[model samples]
Target chain A: TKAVCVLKGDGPVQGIINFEQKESNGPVKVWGSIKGLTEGLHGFHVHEFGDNTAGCTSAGPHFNPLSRKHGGPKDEERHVGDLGNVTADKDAVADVSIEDSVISLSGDHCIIGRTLVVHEKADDLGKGGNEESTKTGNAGSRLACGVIGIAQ
Target chain B: TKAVCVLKGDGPVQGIINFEQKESNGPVKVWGSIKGLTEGLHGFHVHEFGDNTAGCTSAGPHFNPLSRKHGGPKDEERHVGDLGNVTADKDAVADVSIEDSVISLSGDHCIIGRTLVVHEKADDLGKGGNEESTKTGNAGSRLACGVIGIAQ
Candidate 1:
C-alpha cells in the first residue's frame, strides 16, 4: 500500500511526502522534500489527528498508540509516531528518505488519516534530562503539518 | 477501539459524532447530533481524506477501499463508506445512531484520520438512474465535515 501527505506550514514551510509499504509487516519507505525551515535539525513525527480545525495546536500529541515513552525513530521504546529529526541545509530544504518498520501503512497502528508534523526545534529523543523530553522529546512548537491519505 | 469527529460546517451546520468498535472486524456503532440543516434527508458518509485544507472540497471521494458501487448503508454492493443518510426534523436537528458492519475501526480498513461529511441534498443510493449516482449517490454540495481521530 502507498500513502502521501502535502505539508502546509504556518509561515514559509511547505512540502510533499510519500509513503510506500510493500508487505503488511515490512518497513515502509518514507521519502519527501520539505522547504522553508530553519537551516538545522528539526523534529518530525506523526500526530494523533488530522484535525487541524484549530491549526497545529488541535492536532493533539504524538501518535503513541502503544502508550510508549518518547524516543527516537530507531528506539524500541519510542512512540510509533516518532520519526526522529530531519536536517535542513543552508537553503532551508530537507530532502529525506527513511525505511521505518515501526510506523505501518497497515494493521492496527496504520497511519492513514493521521497528521505529520514538523517542529521548530531539534528532537532530544527523550534524553534531554527533563520531564517534557520524556513525553515529547523536547520538540518545540509545530511549524508545519499535513494530513496523511491513501495514494493507492 | 474508538474514534470521534467534531464536525464543522461551511455554513450554520455543526455536530459531534462518535464511533466505537468493540472487537476487530466487528460492527462500528455510529451516533451523533447535527444542527442547522434543512428539514429533510441528507447524505452522510466517510470520505477518503481528512484533507480539508480547501474546506470540504479537498476531502476527495468516498472511502471505497474495495472500489464498489455507491449504494445505501444496508446494501451489500456499496462502498465501505456508504452509511446512507440522516433525516432532520422541522427543528433542523438529526440525532443519529447506526450499527454498521462494513466500516471498521480496526485492521486494514481502519478509518482513523479520514473525514466524515454531511451533504446538502439526499443521497440516491446509486438508484437515481444516472452515472454520477453510481459514484457519489447524487449527494449535493458538502455542508459539513470533520476529521476522524482516535479516542482511545
Candidate 2:
C-alpha cells in the first residue's frame, strides 16, 4: 500500500518530501523535505484522532498503534503515534527520513488515516511534570500540519 | 518594567517579535531564540497567565489585554492578549519580532509577566467555527513552550 501527504497553504507550507519503507522492521520508513520553516528542531508526530478541533487541540494524542501510554517517540513503551522530532536547518528547511515497522500504508496499524503535526517548541519527550505533563516530551503547540493519505 | 525571556532549550526561535503592553499605548520590542526544534510553522502565543505547574496546557488562552472574545490573532476587535502566531522555517527556527502601539518595556500593559506556548499544529485563524466547534482547521496540539520575564 502506497500513499502521499500534502499540507495546504493556510499560512506557510511549501516543500516536497519522500518516504520509503526501511529494511528493518520497527516503523515505516519516512523521508521528505520541509521548507519555509524556522531554523532548528521541531516536534513531529502522527496524532491518533483527526478532529482538528480546538484549533488543532482535538487531534488527541499520538497515533500509538501499540496503544502504549504517553511517552517519547523513541521510548519503547511510548505510544505508537510517536514519530519523534525533526530538525530544520538555517533556511528553515528539514530533510528527514526514519524507519518504522509499526506503521504501514495499508494495514491495521497504517498511518494513512492519521495526521502529521509540527510544533513550535521542542518536545521534552514527555518528561515534564504537571497537568500538561510532557508525556509526549511537552512538544508544545501545533504550528503546521498535513494529512497522510494513500498515494494515488 | 524589565523582564527576562527564556526558551528553555526546547526549540530555536527567530523573527522580529515583540512584547506589547496590554492596556498601554505602546509595545516593547525584544529578540530571542528557541533552540532544538523541528522544521515548520508552530502555533505561538502568550498565555493568559503563567504557570508551568500543569505542564504547558495550564498556560491557558492568549493574553488578551482588551479582554475581547477568543478569535484569530489578526482579528481587529480581538483580545489584547492575542499576539498572533509565529512561523518556523525549514530549520525549525522562528525569527520573531513585533511592533505595537499599546505596550512598552516600562509602563502599563507590559508583557513581562506572561507565558509563551508552542503548539503542535497551526491555528485556523478562527475561521473554522465558534468556540464549540472542533477540528478547527486541523490544528494539532501543544509541543513546547517558555515564559516571558524581566531581562534582569
Candidate 3:
C-alpha cells in the first residue's frame, strides 16, 4: 500500500508525492518531483481522509493517529500524516528523496486509502513557537492533493 | 456537511460531537457526549481525514493547516482539530461543553466533513519540549473517532 500523488488546486503549486516503501515498520522511501511551487518550504502531510469530494480540505487534517503534531519524518512522535515540508527549489519545483518513518505502507500507520495535501508555506516542524506553530506550522493554503492507494 | 468523527479500532465509540454556530466566523460552540475511553486524559483532536474504512488511522493527523505542534482548545496556537485532552470520568466518559476559536462551520478551519479522533493518553500540549512534544503533544494511540458533519 503506497500513495501515488496527483496535485490539485488552481495555483502554480502543483505536483505529485510518491511513497516508496516495502514494509510496515521502516523508512518509507519517498521520492517524487513536484513543480510549480515557489522557492521555499511547503507544508505537506498525509490527510486523514480518502474522500474525493470537497477537494483537499475534504481530506481533513493530517493523518495522526498518535495525536502528535507537525514534526520531521524522523521525529519519534509525530503525526502519522505529518511528512513535514517539501523544499521547492529556485525553479518552483521540489525534487523529493525523503525517508519517512512516521508513516507505514502497512500496519497501523498505513497509507492505503488515505490522501496527501501540500500546503503553501513551510512546515515549521513545531519549531515556530507561535500560535500556528503548535499545530500546522502556519502553512498557508492547500495547493495540491491526491489519495494514497494500493499500487499494482 | 458538518460534524465528522473517527472511531476506534474495531468496536464503535458511541457519542455526538455537536457544533453550534450560525455563521462561519462565529465561535465554534462545541457540545458533545462521549463514552468508551479509559479513566484518564485522552488526547483529542479533529482529524484531517473523513475516511474511516480503516478506523482512526485513516482519519489521518490532527486538523492543523498551520504545520505546528499540539495544543488545547484554549491554547493561543493549536491545531484546527486540536481540542486537547478529553477528561474521562471514573466511568470512562466525557461530557463535552467546549467552545473553540480555531475551527468553524466555514472558512479555512471549517469542521464540516472532517473527523474527531480521541487518543489513548493525555496530551502534553507541546510543553514537554521534546522531539515528540514539539509535534503531537505526546498524545498516544487512537482510541475513538467520528466525523464532523452538518446538523440541521
Candidate 4:
C-alpha cells in the first residue's frame, strides 16, 4: 500500500515526496525530495494532525500515539511522528528515504490523513534534555509543509 | 486517521466549521459570527498553511490546488479555498453559513487542520479582470482568521 505524497512549500522549498509500504504490517517508507533548507540537518516529523482545516503551525505537535516524551526515530519510545531528520545536500535539497516503523498506511496508526512538516532547524532527537526539546523538539520555524495523502 | 481541532476562542470572532463525513457526505459547513468590522462583505477563504505560525499574508494565497484564477464561488476558475464573501449585518456581526464543495471534515480535501481567514474588505471575486483581481480577488488585509477542525 502506498500513498503518493505531494510535498509543497509556501516558499522556495518545494518537491515531490513519495511514500510506500512494502508490507501490510511492515514499516512505511517515505522517499522524496524537500528543498529550500540550508543544506544541513532539519527537523522533520508528521504533525499531530491530518486536520489541516486549521493552520500548519497550529497543526499541533509530533504524533505521539503512546502519549510519551519526544524521542529519536529508533528510540524505545517516540512520537509516531518522530521520523527524525532529513539531510539536505549543499544544493539546499533534502532527500527523505527513511522508513518509519510506527506509522501505517491503513488501520490504527495510519498516516494517510495527517500534516507533514519540515522544520527550519534540525531535530535533536530528544537528546537536547530541555523542556522545549521534549515539548517541541525546538525545531524552530516551519519551512515547508503539506498533507500526506494517497499517492497518484 | 482522525483528530479533533478548534480555536474555542473568546476573541471578537467565534464559532465553528464542522464536518461529519463517513457518517454522511454532507457539505462542509462553515458557521460563525465575526465581529469588529463594519457591516459589509468580507473575503473569506481557506489558506494554504493550517497553522497560524505565519501571519495571514504569510499564510500564502487561497488554497488553489488546480491552479486557477481568483474568481467567485460560481466562477469556473475559482480556487478551492475561495468561498466568496461573508456579509455582516449592520452591527458588524456576520454569521457565516455557507456550503463548501472543496473542503471536507475527513478524507480527500479534508480541511480539519487548515487556517480559515476573513478579509477586511470584500473580495472582488475576480469580476474585475485585472491582474490582482484574478490572482487574489484583491482581498485586502486579513481581519480575522480561524482554523477549521472536527466536531460531532
Candidate 5:
C-alpha cells in the first residue's frame, strides 16, 4: 500500500517529509519545514544504511548506485543518495521538497528502512573542491535526523 | 587527546535536548543543555549510525556493542549505543554531563564516530508490555541527532 509519513525533527523546530511504500513511476517525493536553519542553502541527501541508532551516524555512506565516489546532489555520476541541498530564509526556517527515482518506498530499492540526514553546511554542488566533497560534498556535520518507517 | 563539546538545539529557544556526544576519557567532559522542554523525563540514547542524508531517516539503529538486539539504553547486555534518557524540569532545560570511563568510553568498544539520537516519546524502560517495547523500549521515532566525532 502507498503511504505518506511525517516525522518531526528533534522538536517542533524541525520537520521531515517521508514517503513509504508508495506507487510512483519516478523518484520518491518529500516536503516539510525546518526552523532554526540559517537563511541559505543546506546540503541534503539519502544514505545507504538505516541505522538511526547513532542519532545520525549509523546511516553509513551515501547510496552510491554506480559505486562512484561521493559528489554533490547534482553531480552527473554522484551517489544515488545525493539530493543536493535545501534553502532556508533569514528566520532560520526552510521549506524544502524534492524527488528522486532511485529511492523507492517499496521494492528492492525501497528506502522504508533507510535514513535521511541534514547537514550543518551547504553543498557547493561539487564546486567546493575537496576530496571528501565527492564522498560527503564536504558537508559539515549532521545536525538532525529521522528514520523512514511505514506510516501507522 | 581528550576533548569536550557542547551543542544547543537547532534554535536558541532552549529545552529540547536532542543529541550530545563527548570524547570518552578526554580531559574535558561533554554536556547537553536546553532552555525549555516539557516538564518530565525524556528518553535519550546513542544511535549506531550517522547518515543525515535525507534529513534524519538516514540515521540508523542504536549502537549494539554486543550485537545484541534493539533494547533500552539502560538495559543490561544492551547495545553499546544504549544511553537511556534524560529528565527535564519545569524550566524545560536539561543540564546533563557524563564522565568517560573504560566501559562507556574508548577501548575495543567506544562511542566515537557514532550518533546520538533523542526521541519524541519516553522510554518506559521496557515496561510497555509489548514486543517492540523489548526491542526499542517503546521509544518513539528519532527527534534529534548529533554525530559523535573525535574533537580535533
Candidate 6:
C-alpha cells in the first residue's frame, strides 16, 4: 500500500512526501522532495494529527501512541513518528528517504491521516537535556506540513 | 479565538475555511471561499480523525464523540461534528457561512486537531432512511479535506 502528502506553509516552502508499505505490518519506506529551506538540517516527523487549521501549530505533538520520548528514528527508545533531521542543500532543497518499522500503514498502529511536519531547527534527538528536547527535540517552529493520505 | 482550514483534493478543488469564537462555550462562526466544485449542494462535516493516510477514507467516520446518530446541524439529535451541507453556485464556487453552538474550539470539546472534509454528494441529513443515510448521509467520496488549525 502507498500514501502521499503535499506539504505547504505560509512561506515559500513546499514538498511532496510518499510512503510505501510492501505488506501489512512491514517496514514503511518514506521519501520526499522538499524545497525552500535553510541550507542545513531540519527536524522532521509525523505529527499526531493532520489539522493545519491555524497552520502547523494545530498538528500537535509527534505521533507517539506508545507515549515514548523524543529520539532519533534508529534509537530503541523513541516516538514512533521520529525520523530525525533532513539536510538541505545550498539551494534550499532537501531530499528525504527513510525506512521505519515502528510506523505502520495498516492496523491500529497506522500513521495514515496524520500530519508530516518539517521543523525550523535541527532535532536534538532527545540529547538536549531539556524539557522540550525529550518532548519535541526542541525542533522549533513547524515550517511546513501536510496530511498523510492514501495513494494508488 | 479562531481556527482555520484549507481543503484540497486530487482534482481541481480547493478552498480556504475560517472559524471564529467570541468567547468560551459560545457559538462558532464558520466561513469559507471554495471553488472548483459542481453546481449544487455537497456534504460537509468534521471527521473523527485527521488521518488522511488514504485520502478521506482514513479520516474515520464523523466527529461523533457523542456517538449519536447522524443528523442535520439543527437537528436536536445530531453529531457534534455534523454542520450539514454547503451549496455551490453555477460558477463552481461555494461560499460557506455557518453559526454552530455545538462545535467548540476549546476545552475537551475542542476540534483544533481534526479534519474538515467536503464530499462528492449531498448529505441526506439522516432523512434518507437507508443505512448509509443514517451513517454518512450517503455523502459520496471525499473530494477535498484539510486539518483544522489554530489561527492567530
lDDT of model 6 at residue B14?
A: 93
Model 1 lDDT, full chain set? 0.86
> What's model 1's TM-score?
0.77
Q: Which regions of candidate 6 deviate over 4 angstroms?
A: A1-40, A44-143, A147-152
Model 4 residue B107 CA deviation (Å) reads 10
Listed models, DockQ each: 0.28, 0.01, 0.02, 0.09, 0.04, 0.13
Stretch of 10 with least lDDT, candidate 3 chain B: B1-10
lDDT at residue B121 of model 6 (Cα atoms): 89
Task: Give each model's whole-structure lDDT.
Answer: 0.86, 0.54, 0.70, 0.69, 0.57, 0.84
lDDT tens digits by residue: candidate 6, A1-152: 87777788888888888889998988999998899999999999999865665677778889888898899988989998998998899999998888889898766566665788999999999999998999999999989998676455
Q: Which wins on lDDT, candidate 1 or candidate 5?
A: 1
Question: Which candidate, 2 or 4, would have the higher DockQ against the true structure?
Answer: 4
Better of 3 and 5 by DockQ: 5
Q: For residues B1-152, what per-residue lDDT tens digits would candidate 1 score against the true structure?
A: 87777788769999888898998878999998999999999999999876665777878999998989999988989988989999988999999788899999876577776789999999999899998998999999999987686664
| Poorest 10 consecutive residues by lDDT, candidate 1 chain B | B49-58
lDDT of 3 by residue, A25-131 (tens): 56788878788888999888887765545666777777778887666666775678887888888988899878867678666676655667888888888788886
Per residue, candidate 4 scores C-alpha lDDT tens digits across A44-70 of 888766554444665677777779898
Candidate 4 vs 6: which has more lDDT: 6
Give the range of the ten consecutive residues with the poorest summed lDDT in model 5 chain A: A1-10
Ranking by TM-score: 1, 6, 4, 3, 5, 2
Q: Which stretches in model 2 have alpha-carbon errors above 4 Å?
A: A22-27, A51-58, A130-134, B1-152
lDDT score, residue B23, model 1? Answer: 83
Q: What is the TM-score of candidate 6?
A: 0.62
How does model 2 fare in lDDT?
0.54
Local error of candidate 6 at residue B44 (angstroms) = 0.7
Q: What would you estimate as the lDDT of candidate 5?
A: 0.57
Ordered from best to worst DockQ, the candidate numbers read 1, 6, 4, 5, 3, 2
